[PDB]
Amino acid sequence: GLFGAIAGFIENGWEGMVDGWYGFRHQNAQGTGQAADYKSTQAAIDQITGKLNRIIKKTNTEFESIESEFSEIDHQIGNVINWTKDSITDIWTYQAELLVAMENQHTIDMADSEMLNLYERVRKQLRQNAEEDGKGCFEIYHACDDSCMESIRNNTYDHSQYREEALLNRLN
Amino acid sequence: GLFGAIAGFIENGWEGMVDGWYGFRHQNAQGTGQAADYKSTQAAIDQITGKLNRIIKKTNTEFESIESEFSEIDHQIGNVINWTKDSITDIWTYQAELLVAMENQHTIDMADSEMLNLYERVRKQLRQNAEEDGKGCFEIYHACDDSCMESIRNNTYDHSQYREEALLNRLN
Amino acid sequence: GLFGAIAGFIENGWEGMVDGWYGFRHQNAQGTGQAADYKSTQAAIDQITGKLNRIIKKTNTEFESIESEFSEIDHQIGNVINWTKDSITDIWTYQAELLVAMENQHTIDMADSEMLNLYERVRKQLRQNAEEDGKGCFEIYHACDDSCMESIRNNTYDHSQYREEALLNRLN
Amino acid sequence: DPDKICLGHHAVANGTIVKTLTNEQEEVTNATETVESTSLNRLCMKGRNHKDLGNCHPIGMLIGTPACDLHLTGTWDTLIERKNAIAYCYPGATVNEEALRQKIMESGGISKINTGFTYGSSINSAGTTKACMRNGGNSFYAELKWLVSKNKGQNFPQTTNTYRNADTAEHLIMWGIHHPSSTQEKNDLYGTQSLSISVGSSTYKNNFVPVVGARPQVNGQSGRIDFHWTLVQPGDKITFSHNAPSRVSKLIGRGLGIQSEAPIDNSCESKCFWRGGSINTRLPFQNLSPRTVGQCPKYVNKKSLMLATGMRNVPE
Amino acid sequence: DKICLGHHAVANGTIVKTLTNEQEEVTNATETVESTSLNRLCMKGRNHKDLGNCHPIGMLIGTPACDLHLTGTWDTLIERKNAIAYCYPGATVNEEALRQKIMESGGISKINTGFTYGSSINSAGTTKACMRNGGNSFYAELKWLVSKNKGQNFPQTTNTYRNADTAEHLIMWGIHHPSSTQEKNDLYGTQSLSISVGSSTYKNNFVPVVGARPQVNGQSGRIDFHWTLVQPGDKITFSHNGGLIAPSRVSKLIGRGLGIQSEAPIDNSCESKCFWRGGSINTRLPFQNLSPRTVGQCPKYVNKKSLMLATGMRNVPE
Amino acid sequence: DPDKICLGHHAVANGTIVKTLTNEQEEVTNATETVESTSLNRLCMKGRNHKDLGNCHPIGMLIGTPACDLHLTGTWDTLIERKNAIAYCYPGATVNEEALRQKIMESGGISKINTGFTYGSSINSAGTTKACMRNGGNSFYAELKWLVSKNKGQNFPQTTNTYRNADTAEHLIMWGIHHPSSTQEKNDLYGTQSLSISVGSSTYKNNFVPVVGARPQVNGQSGRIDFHWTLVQPGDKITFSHNGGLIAPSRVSKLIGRGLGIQSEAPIDNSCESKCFWRGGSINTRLPFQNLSPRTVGQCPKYVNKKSLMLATGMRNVPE
């Protein structure tokens, strides 16, 4: 996909994650946890809602009948209406297919972006104390209790606190 | 948004900044100073100018009148005329709403993109001499005068000049 | 462009590369080599095949004659038909222009993004064993022979195997 | 040896296939349909003053055929017509039938108006046909009268009448011209002497000549009666000379004409009907039928079109 | 040290719709739907012909209102509310057809019928509605057929126009329908009249009907008009014993031109290509919400008050 | 002195210009056309039971013009009509002309059904004209009879002919009213009695009156035969009350199935196959748009007012 995050460097999604669209799976000395990112999940869902608002609706235009159901009409103007109707349908059928294809493209890519944008937020927070895994993970090079993990998720992580310790571990 | 540079990792834009769209604000021994970027601010507008050139136009097709303004024509064909005139208007109405929506969507994200593209152009120049703040700022770990700061803005800065110095400032 | 890769930090394309759309050039002690990435080439080809399967077709709507070629049509209905047909081929011209304008913009950006994605893939492979040139190259700080360069393209490069060798050369 | 934090996205075992610009088999976490395929076999009639006409054809209402006795007048916002509806008790048709019938179905109401005509003993205006059943006995169109000689064969007087329009808006008048099955049936009714029908107004004048000739029997009568109609504008005298409408009619504002075979529903609200019922969908497109009336989803030549409401679905 | 990247913003941020957001704040925007109208017709660089009170059909007939507009070349014709082209009352058969056929054209050019009549026949019949030079008259390109001797039945005559031109001509004629027998019989005859026009690509029988109808312009009687298009190198024949009102000249319609129907005034310091009842539409924009009823090179009609096109990034204030 | 590895995209020297949302002059690797400007000057008729009428007009297939003899009956799925074809050999017209040809051009065949109309000893049923020459001598429309009195001057006898539809599908009956050139002519053929032709069915009814009047000669005849038509539903019968001036039908037509109806000057080709046609010929393109003609028939690409629309099939071209 456009942003290389979803069906990209991240190998697959998580049937496990039921409390949100995007989230974290951590692993430290003291075990493992899993929390869903609210702000990004709400961002995607807001954006999709805005689509359904504009897409699921109809014009407030009154269409009287122009062709009788229960009787015959002049053959040559019968042919004119059939032709105009088939044309007007051919437009609407095409316009409809294009809209949905275009939107489906945008929706997939927008969702791929919100994921990447979260992954970037995290890279910057962790600064020099972590290195990129390749598969959408960060190998943190200091001890990271649940409070230190929860600090990375809630964007309240100061790198300098753990910086001296991490640079040591990294350079070996 | 899509590129996460505007309403993004960049907290807010600058109301003080005029004669530019994107640019820089450095802080150093000499003191605080602002400056604009040309290559980025022009690429943005030139892309929007391209859009205005295409959307702000009409068809040269010449339409006669099919309806008498001062006479009521045959009731059944005036119903056929009304039905197509209504149908066409719903199409042009749908087409206008969809055109401006998707172009607005793309305008907004194209700008975000040029802001991201610059931030990345600066980052790759600075190489191992600076570190990302997270708010769209680079901390530099070597003394940088207005000559040094201008060499960043002008895409002329040399990383190997202050490398040995900076690395030992980062490691501490 | 949007992704900054093509007509961006990669300054120009290679008229020499005839075996794919994306690929690697390297310089080591054994000398020089060129090669294409098959996977990221197909990624881009297969999305263009998609656009063409969906854009290269006509509606299976059967249309009959409402205008006579060889005899005079009634003035009233003929003015209606002329106005209808005019209004319809205004719609379809406008849709055809907008269609390709949008798809052209996407095909380009799509192809940009598939360059950026390959750059970020190998960037992440190399980890701390290399540094961003800024012109879309990775200066490797460990002896990388033809089997080493092969391992980068094949995505089998174990970064830890040359890590110690490479971090000494990064710092001094 | 070092600790890990991992970024990831949700996923489901049962993803939906949608179509993007590039892919036709693009699997996503969720998608909602945008084309209504399922209808309801009923006519939504809530907050709508509906007036089902059943056996009554709308032309019949103005003309006064016995089936249209209940629907002779009224005000509504919606008009419903039915298959094999009876317009003419005695056989015939209407010049610009569908054009007139349109204006009835465009109009939200009909108000009859007494014409105030009187006659002599020479012409018997009150001619009753056995074709039109009313209350066991014979009868005639409620708002019309028949032009015939008291004694068959006698020369039909050339009486002429005119109707004033003292109303704010337009008034719709209809009159019945008869075409006999032969000369033998013509001589009785109007006399051997050849004769013309004509009309006059500030805008409308027209000659009418009866077409006499043999034809197949329709509803027990080979003879054929055809009804002509014209508007008469306020403060204008309507004058027609013949060798017979007691009441004219007036259309009231506007309303939606349905033409369906489906039954009505007490507590159903919609704005879109067709020959097969009402389409009550919140969706923007629909493939039920291209013939529809009222605010409606645009017809599309597509069974299903799926709109993704979630990201790419990628299981382990 | 520290170096920051950042973008401009504003105070009075302007709102625009997107695929995802109905209220997106951006720096700059631009309207794409023209809502402001003009109630003046703009005819610079245009050989226009303002008819005024003259109705298009009257130009072929030659009514006293359309004396100036009998001939001419143009690229635009204009028509007013309540334009009168009839002295003697009644409509013309297939009116709207002929009407727009005229308004489609870019000029009327006349050719002479060349119709001589017998010593017994008087061409110069007149009426009290149709007045020219103060006093009574008749239509300028027709002649009312009536016998000199009041009472004597008008004789069966045969007249024939011939189309010499390489183009087609529009021969108009008329038929008088009296309401009375008394002035009918002495003008024409006590007989039942016959009037049988006949061409190569047209034919018809006409019967001058008599009927009781409210008077119009002091006249109880009415006249109706019939017309056809005689072909290049073809002739038309008129057979009649009274009732017919044959033409002195027949029309040729030339080139192309717009047909505008409006009550608006005319300005020649202004140019435009889109018109309607209200006036002119002089805008670069692609869409408009003034009228669905327009002519020329118009913006498309859209059911939207405003549509705003973003010309700048998301406005992020503080 | 470090080992370096570089990533790059392909390019070409002679790259193509396409239009984007933002740029009217954007150089790309490769591009394809979406509008067709090319038309075969042939009608492609492979896998089609077609019928070229030549100078036979479809309407002439029902009345029975000499030119339409090899077109009186048949089956088809495609029906081609040519410029200046012939319906009326004797001068005359048809009311609802454009409606009747359009109805014929929609059909996939014509059957012919005998009316079995009989006439009195006084009536000459074999009326003939020089305007319809056939097999050397004078003739008349195959599917109609000119009824004139056999005793020049004698008033045409009152007659009543009626056709019943015994078939399951509707039939298309049509007849002519003759309109003579002079009162001398009228009286010679039908006599002095006032003429009235009355026609009636369950669904149709109308009266016609011959028109005597001078008028130009066409095929060297001042007289005219205008044609009327109507459908006669299954089971129902249509009856002709007439006293002279009726061109009676000897046969009625049944239209069968559906067909595509092309008006074109371009000649047949049974080797080539198409499903889109126009005046100029065939359009066998796979493309979505076209700028040849806004008048087409069959499954066609949509006419656009555009010479060319190029659709990028590769990346931006940034050349060395």
Ligand SMILES: CC(=O)N[C@@H]1[C@@H](O)[C@H](O[C@@H]2O[C@H](CO)[C@H](O)[C@H](O[C@]3(C(=O)O)C[C@H](O)[C@@H](NC(C)=O)[C@H]([C@H](O)[C@H](O)CO)O3)[C@H]2O)[C@@H](CO)O[C@H]1O
């Ligand atoms: C088999 C048979 O002949 N039985 C006769 C029967 O004919 C006759 O009654 C009259 O029959 C004629 C023939 O067609 C008509 O059908 C008459 O029908 C009516 C009608 O349609 O209602 C009766 C009505 O009385 C007539 N109108 C008036 C005002 O009187 C109308 C009308 O004039 C015309 O029919 C219009 O086309 O006709 C029907 O009366 C009787 C005679 O007593 O005797 C049977 O045994």
Ligand SMILES: CC(=O)N[C@@H]1[C@@H](O)[C@H](O[C@@H]2O[C@H](CO)[C@H](O)[C@H](O[C@]3(C(=O)O)C[C@H](O)[C@@H](NC(C)=O)[C@H]([C@H](O)[C@H](O)CO)O3)[C@H]2O)[C@@H](CO)O[C@H]1O
């Ligand atoms: C200049 C001159 O004197 N010429 C006459 C010439 O007209 C005449 O021949 C007949 O002329 C009449 C009237 O002009 C018709 O034109 C005749 O044509 C036919 C026709 O072919 O159509 C002959 C045909 O046999 C007639 N058939 C029937 C069934 O009646 C028809 C038909 O009646 C009319 O066309 C009806 O409009 O007319 C034409 O033969 C000859 C013979 O007197 O003398 C010339 O000098």
Ligand SMILES: CC(=O)N[C@H]1[C@H]([C@H](O)[C@H](O)CO)O[C@@](O[C@@H]2[C@@H](O)[C@H](O)O[C@H](CO)[C@@H]2O)(C(=O)O)C[C@@H]1O
């Ligand atoms: C050519 C001619 O004689 N014209 C008359 C004209 C016609 O003869 C008449 O309109 C045909 O019906 O009649 C004119 O005026 C008439 C009055 O003189 C008569 O008393 O009243 C008539 C109507 O009630 C009639 O109008 C006319 O209409 O102009 C006079 C004109 O010379």
Ligand SMILES: *[C@@H]1O[C@H](CO)[C@@H](O[C@@H]2O[C@H](CO)[C@@H](O)[C@H](O)[C@H]2NC(C)=O)[C@H](O)[C@H]1NC(C)=O
């Ligand atoms: C206009 O379109 C409709 C359908 O597309 C045509 O109606 C069909 O006609 C045949 C027989 O006449 C019926 O058996 C079909 O069932 C009809 N279809 C429907 C849905 O009613 C109609 O013929 C067309 N009109 C013209 C003038 O060609």
Ligand SMILES: *[C@@H]1O[C@H](CO)[C@@H](O[C@@H]2O[C@H](CO)[C@@H](O)[C@H](O)[C@H]2NC(C)=O)[C@H](O)[C@H]1NC(C)=O
């Ligand atoms: C076609 O539509 C126009 C506009 O909706 C109709 O014109 C209006 O009709 C109403 C109701 O009869 C009149 O009272 C109004 O004065 C008209 N309004 C305008 C803005 O013109 C027109 O009647 C419709 N025509 C047909 C044949 O249905």
Ligand SMILES: *[C@@H]1O[C@H](CO)[C@@H](O)[C@H](O)[C@H]1NC(C)=O
């Ligand atoms: C319809 O347009 C064509 C060409 O655009 C023209 O030849 C013709 O005159 C028009 N038809 C009518 C009846 O005006």
Ligand SMILES: *[C@@H]1O[C@H](CO)[C@@H](O)[C@H](O)[C@H]1NC(C)=O
């Ligand atoms: C999303 O999925 C749930 C459960 O499958 C369903 O209720 C919902 O309607 C789907 N789509 C939307 C737009 O809510």
Ligand SMILES: *[C@@H]1O[C@H](CO)[C@@H](O)[C@H](O)[C@H]1NC(C)=O
């Ligand atoms: C931006 O706004 C200024 C003034 O507010 C205006 O002059 C300019 O035209 C706008 N830019 C557009 C419409 O491209």
Ligand SMILES: *[C@@H]1O[C@H](CO)[C@@H](O)[C@H](O)[C@H]1NC(C)=O
């Ligand atoms: C690209 O160009 C070549 C030759 O011009 C062609 O073989 C190839 O199919 C083109 N791509 C398309 C048409 O998609």
Ligand SMILES: [Ca+2]
């Ligand atoms: Ca059809």
Ligand SMILES: [Ca+2]
């Ligand atoms: Ca209406």
